[PDB]
Design a protein around this ligand. Structure first.
Ligand SMILES: [Cl-]
Ligand code: NA
Ligand SMILES: [Ru+3]
Length: 129
């Protein structure tokens, strides 16, 4: 599913990401924009042999099982294909664990490099939330 910007904002808000660990909704929308282009089906293989999955590009080294990532963990206790669903529940629940792990939203490289320190409120402009 390719979400609209405000469509995704409403869903993320609906699932309690606004202000989760102190990160405003616009941070999460911006992260999704630059991680996945708002596409739940996005997958990207990493140099380390892991793959990132879904709207928030969650990693098979630590967070989900894809059967092809050696020595990895599955700390969200899910097949990585769950992160590609049109229903973002699994991605959100897993993201809450990731952002709680110590480095906050720095776990998302596209957030750090493209959202952090920017006017992230812009990402929810025009949305009825
Ligand atoms: Cl933090
Ligand atoms: Na894994
Ligand atoms: Ru840790």
């Amino acid at each position: 599913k390719v979400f609209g910007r405000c469509e995704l904002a409403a869903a993320m808000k609906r699932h309690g990401l606004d202000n989760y660990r102190g990160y405003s909704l616009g941070n999460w929308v911006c992260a999704a924009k630059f991680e996945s282009n708002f596409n739940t089906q996005a997958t990207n293989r990493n140099t380390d042999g892991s793959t990132d999955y879904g709207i928030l590009q969650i990693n098979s080294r630590w967070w989900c099982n894809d059967g092809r990532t050696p020595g990895s963990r599955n700390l969200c206790n899910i097949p990585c294909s769950a992160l590609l669903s049109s229903d973002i529940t699994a991605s959100v629940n897993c993201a809450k664990k990731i952002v709680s792990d110590g480095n906050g939203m720095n776990a998302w490289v596209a957030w750090r490099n493209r959202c952090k320190g920017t006017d992230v409120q812009a990402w929810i402009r025009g949305c009825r939330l």
